[model samples]
Target chain A: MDLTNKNVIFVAALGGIGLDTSRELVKRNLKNFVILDRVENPTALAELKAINPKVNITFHTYDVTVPVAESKKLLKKIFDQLKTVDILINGAGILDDHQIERTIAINFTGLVNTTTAILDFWDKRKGGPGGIIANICSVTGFNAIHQVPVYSASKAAVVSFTNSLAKLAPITGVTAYSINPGITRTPLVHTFNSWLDVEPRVAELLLSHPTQTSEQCGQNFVKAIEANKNGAIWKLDLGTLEAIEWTKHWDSHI
Target chain B: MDLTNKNVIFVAALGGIGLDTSRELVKRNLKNFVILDRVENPTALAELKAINPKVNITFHTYDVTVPVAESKKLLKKIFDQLKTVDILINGAGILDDHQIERTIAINFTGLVNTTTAILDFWDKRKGGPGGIIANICSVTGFNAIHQVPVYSASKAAVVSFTNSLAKLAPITGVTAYSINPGITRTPLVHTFNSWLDVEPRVAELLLSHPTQTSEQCGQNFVKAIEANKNGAIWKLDLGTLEAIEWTKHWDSHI
Candidate 1:
């Protein structure tokens, strides 16, 4: 999990916790960094470069909601240019219940497609270098947050998908894991009151939960990246990290 | 939960467990029946009608994967005809690892759209009759089935969505619940080995789990319908049913 000289591709790393995490990684002396987001963030890229001028940084205007084939092509081009990838962090997500389709697309399906596309170049069985696949899930995914059902559902999909990929890690040589942040202060959370009308009950639920700054979430998430445990789900909240072990709800016997 | 003189709309009930469940409902002397699926099953409709001639039955060629507006329009037409829907059972799903997009569309997004559409006419707070909103989830959702990651993710989304909707049940007066069937003998399960290459380890995992007949699943689902608990998740496997209570994995303190 050492960041020194690792070729990393972080999807949607130009803003929010993604940006904070990227800034942390830049200080770790990454050899080559390819960051993708929907819009160009030259200032963020410049800041990362300033942290470690020795690190090579590239930014691509990437949209996760595009068609699968087109996304694959774009990813292939990036992989071909880099020749090797050591880490992939999928951070592309949206939290609008009004845009259910787009929310599911960017938060779940797009992430899945991006991860699988990288597997083509990272799976050990496919004559490629094995790497780490990490994603940002949410506490709502672990336990349903009734307010934003679609957003919670999308995160749950991510958690389940990451867990399943972890099972294939031994064969693929790709370590897959996720970190679930609880009530992080970000633009996504800022929309809660407006996107979902602030009902008294919903406000009560929100006030009842611990909230953390994006910087606090990002700093711990970087630790999770370094931990590099396959199939691990880490919960980052209130400036503390807890490992969530999978509980088997039923026993199977054929 | 009683079917006598009740208006029921079962989505994707033409074949498999949907068909089996619909057949059971038809025998219960329903007042009106509206069934929807991608393809028309006249014979199945005829069978249901024969079971209870007193029941007014209608079939529609419904594709859940269509655009949101189109699907909403069709659902509106059906709701207008039925006037009042007493129960809604969302049974449309697929299990193809190859068709990730379609699998997600049908299993998760389509189910969400259908459920929300029904809320327009069934929400008790909105000048409509309150009713039951039940969905067909799977054991894979409760635990990660590594073999078909996308399918498992889709199912997990359904389980979470149903759970969230259950939280809103008190306000909406719609009993939102789901049943997670384990390795049921259905067309969806039949395609497992073929859709996914029959890898030996996957075969071992499959053989190790207990499986139930679709009829067994259907009969138990009817029991769940009668159970009528809001936000309840029932587990059906090996010809038995168990209620899965939501366990809190984290405590929050703002």
Candidate 2:
């Protein structure tokens, strides 16, 4: 998991956790990687570049909600340049339930499309070199956020998708992991306040509740990428990190 | 929850469990309903009309996946005829990863659209008398169906959505419940075999397992509507019904 000198593909880089995690990697001597975001964050992008002059980073303006075909085209450009992908962090996410379709389009279906597209190049059994495929699920994923059921279920999808791929991790050389962070105060949380009027009870559990900083969440993503078990779910809430071994409720009893 | 002469809306009526549940209601002195499916099932539709000549049934060839505007038009027509909605059962679904978008589109988004559209006509506080919304989720809804993660996640969305709406049930005069039926032998199950080859371990657990008859699932739907506690999840496996009260894992421990 030593990311230094490894060719990595980081999705949703302009985002809160994405930018900070990228900084963490840069400071830790991460050298070769490609970052994709819906829009370019010049300041953050420049900050990473300035952090390490030696770092070879490629930036792409991309949106995960785009059709899978379009994403594959971008993947082609990156794969052609890098030749191989060592780590793929599907980090793009959205929180607004104003449009549940958009919420699911980006969070759930978008992530799925991007991950499967990468499988084109990351599947070891398919003659492609395997790597690590990590997704930023959420604390809400383990616990369905009643206030935002769409977002909750989308993150839940990420966790389940990663779990399934974890079995193929060894076979395909692509280890999968789901990282669930507590309600961190990112831009997303600021807008979450709207839920106060939508689901006051659910909002009561959040909003003013103590939250972890983005940096704390960023650090854990690096840790998870470094040594998290294949298909394991990590909860980094309020700076506390723990493993949430989800029990298969169906296989068990009512 | 008494269906006698009540106006009920059934989505995916052509589905395995859906058709059976419609029969359950029809034979039990139920009357006045609108049934929707991607395509009309004349045999089943005719059978229901024959069962109860007094029944006022409107057979609409509707697909929940249609855009909200289009769906609204259909809903308007139905509401115009029935004057009110008493019950809604979102029973349509599919299991496939080859096309994840379509999977979520129909099962998750479609259900969301249909539910909300009917809510426009059933919200009690909004002048219309609210009734009951029973979403036909799956045993995998509570547990992530890693095999078909998309389907698993979509159902999880249904469960989460139902749970959230249940919180507003008493206030809105609408009770929401999620019905999770164990693996049952239906046309869908035969198609599920494809996923077994795609994800053998998951398929093994499903195909080798005994399944409940659709009739058992239908009767349970009747029971769920009859007495399923709002916000409660019911597991109908082996023809035995029990509540799946998901423990708050996050609040319980780290």
Candidate 3:
């Protein structure tokens, strides 16, 4: 799990947890690092460069709402330059149910697009170096948040997708997993009340839970990358990491 | 549970389980029905009309992949005619993972669009008559199928969405649930090998399972409609129905 001399691709690494985690990974002395998001952040890129001046740094504009073929084309450009990928961190998502289609697209389908697009590069059976595919999920993935049904469903899709990909890891040599951050303080959280207009009781219940800063979430994000267990879902909250596991409903039959 | 005089809207009801179960409902004497799919099936409509000669039958074209506002506009036309919807059966889905984007759009996002579009008509809190929202899920919704990761995740999203909506049933007066069918002999199942050229061992394992007919699935579909329990996930296989309940990973904490 040494971060040195590894080629890393961080999708949506401009703000919040993605930015903070990019800084942490850069400090680990990566050989080559690429950041892809909808917009470029010169300040964040300079800060990352300050941490590791010798590391190769690149940035590209990526739209998750685009077709899968388009996304693969974009990833191919990065692969051609980097030659190989050691790690791929998918952090593109949104947290609004008012626009259900957009939320599901960015949160679930986009992540799927990126993972499937990069599978061949990570598949050992395809004569490629095995690598890690880490997806950013949420606590609502396992525990449905009634206030935002689409958001919860999108995260659940991510958890299930990662779990399904785990079965192929033995053959593909690609370790796929998820990091679930609970009640993190970010713009994604600050916009909740604006869209939800939830009941006071529901708001009170949400406020009662322990919230974590994005910096804390980013620290655990690196730890989750270091864990590298296929299909593992790590819950990061209050600066603590806990591996979340649940019994399948069809456990007895399957 | 009385079917007499109930107004029902069946999405993608032209073929397979949707067509068969629709016949069963018509035989019970539905007051009104509006069939919505990508195309119109005159034969299927005639069959339902034969079941109950006096029952009113209508048809419309619905593309689930369209934007949410478009689907709502289409739904508004139906609501304007039917005046109300007592039951909504969402049966639009696909099983191909080769086209990951389309598979997810049809199986998960499209279903979400339809459900969200019809919510206002069924929400009692919004001065509308309460109704049932039954989604067609799959066994892979709870059990991860390595062969079809996107398909499994799509169904998992449906399961989670229905469960999340269940919490609002008390206030919305809508009962949201899922019907998980296993190994049905539909075109959807026959195309599995075409997209997934799996190992012989994996193919052998798939042949070991017991598969059911769509008619058997339709029969259980009616029973599930009769059950009408909010948040209930019913697994129907080989003419038997089992209630599936799972322990949440964050059960103790939540």
Candidate 4:
């Protein structure tokens, strides 16, 4: 739980889970943290900066999936400043009204772009044991939800991609894990509620299933990083039954 | 297993299993079948045409992932000629060494494009009452294979997408099923012999491991169609214990 000097890069760290996670990390004296978002001077960023002005926190505005050339350029700038990324959290994703292209671009491809860029650095480092890439997936990825087809597909891609990357970890030194949470009280969920006829029972089930604060999710993510588990799928529900079951499956397989 | 006069559209019918599947349907008295592929003159197309010159079979060369505008044009042309696509078999996919983009394009997005196009037609028919869409997925989608990373990811996407689409069948009137065969001894397997160290062993396992011949795999696919099981993952592996266990689990859940 002690990350005194760990250089953490939190992608999509503007609001909701990412902001709360950054806040918790700062409170825990994790000063060497950088937040990246596509927006400039967002309210969450302002709040985070106000929380700890001397936390060595820098915010960068860059679209993660702007072709390989542009992405490489932006990534190089970030990687040059921060020689090594101890932990990379991929939280930059969107649920865009079930538009397949937009959903795939932001949620799946963006995750790939960022992770690929960071892993490239890890691969080149002399005797560098790679860091962790924790992708925020959803339970919708495993069991298809009727309403949000594209979003579910995108998250499923993330989950599948994480598993694929995990098999390559022994060679690359980068461990991969996907955290598939059922549902949390996020702005995105509020938006989804408007279009989709989500029953109260279903909503309650989703909400009560494994409700974790953004801070708690972040803490658990960090724990996953420290644990060095590959192909780890953490289902963050109230009780750790689902997560434990998944972990057991992974352990048995390994 | 009896489809005397039923019309079927077999997309991607130019290749290995697709060609074999199309021929099997023809033998079963499905005289009206439309075959579409990216290739203008596939070797199998000529043989299929020669088999039954009177069979109302048409071959069209069209890229599935063309821009919406172009795809719409091609689809309109096809719809104008053929009244209704009662059953759609999506057998167009490839797993070359071109890595992620090419694999995803052909295997995942290509299937989506064809299925979406057919859905447009099915939506217009009054009392259409949903047609069947059978997508060719693979066992690799279920379990991870370290070698074929992109292929595994692409097939997994197809499986997940099929699961998601099954939920939409009620409103859309389009049932979707995924057919995943274990390892099969196809011409494609021959290409991997030189590059893969375990090619011979894999070939032997595929040939003897409850695997299905192209004709057998095709017959099993027809069986799924006759049963009209939505969200069903039909495995053609003869006595595959793992597949049987997984299929039982899937059936229990459904």
Find the candidate with the highest DockQ and give its number: 1
Candidate 1 lDDT over A1-254, as tens digits, reads: 79899888899998788988888888888989999899998888888888889899998888987776777788789888878888899999887777888888999999888887777777787777788998888887888667678888988899989988887777778888988988777777664531123143454566556678888888998899888888899998777787898777754331
Local lDDT at B174 for model 1: 75
lDDT of 2 at A51: 84
Docking class of 4: acceptable
Off by over 4 Å in 4: A124-128, A193-228, A238-254, B96-98, B124-129, B187-215, B238-254
Better of 3 and 4 by TM-score: 3
Please report the TM-score between candidate 2 and the true structure.
Answer: 0.92
User: What TM-scores do the predictions have?
Assistant: 0.94, 0.92, 0.92, 0.84
Order of candidate numbers by lDDT, starting with the best: 1, 3, 2, 4
lDDT of 2 by residue, B1-254 (tens): 56777778888876788888888877766567678888888998888888787877778888777877788789889888777777888888887666688888987888878876776777676777877888888877667555576677777777767776787665567788888988876777665522223464554467576778999988887887788478888888888788877656453121
Residue B118 in model 3: lDDT: 81
The complex in candidate 2 yields a DockQ of: 0.43
Residue range A1-254, candidate 3, lDDT tens digits: 88889899988987788988887888888899889899888898888888889788889999888876787798889889889889898899887677777888899989988887787566676787878888888888887777777888899899888887776777777888899888777777664531133332443466567777888888989988887888888988778898887556652122
Kept native contacts, fraction for each prediction: 0.58, 0.38, 0.57, 0.23
| lDDT for each residue of candidate 2 in A1-254, tens digit (9 for 90 to 100) | 67778777889876887887888877666657688889988998888899897888789988999887888899988989878777888888888665778878888888888877787777766788777888888877777666676677677767766776776565566788888888786887665522213454444457567788889988877887888578888888888778787766686221
**Model 1 spans > 4 angstroms off:** A193-209, A251-254, B193-209, B251-254
RMSD of 2: 3.0
- Angstrom error of the Cα, residue B12, model 2: value is 0.7
Candidate 4 per-residue lDDT over residues B1-254, each given as its tens digit: 35666677777776666776676677656657787778865567767777766667777787766754565677678767766557778877775523445566677767766766566666523354467788888766666444455566567677777876776677677888887765555676444321112122433444443445677666766666677677777766642312222221111021
Per-residue accuracy of model 3 over B52-94 as CA lDDT, tens digit each? 8877888888888998788889878888988878888889987
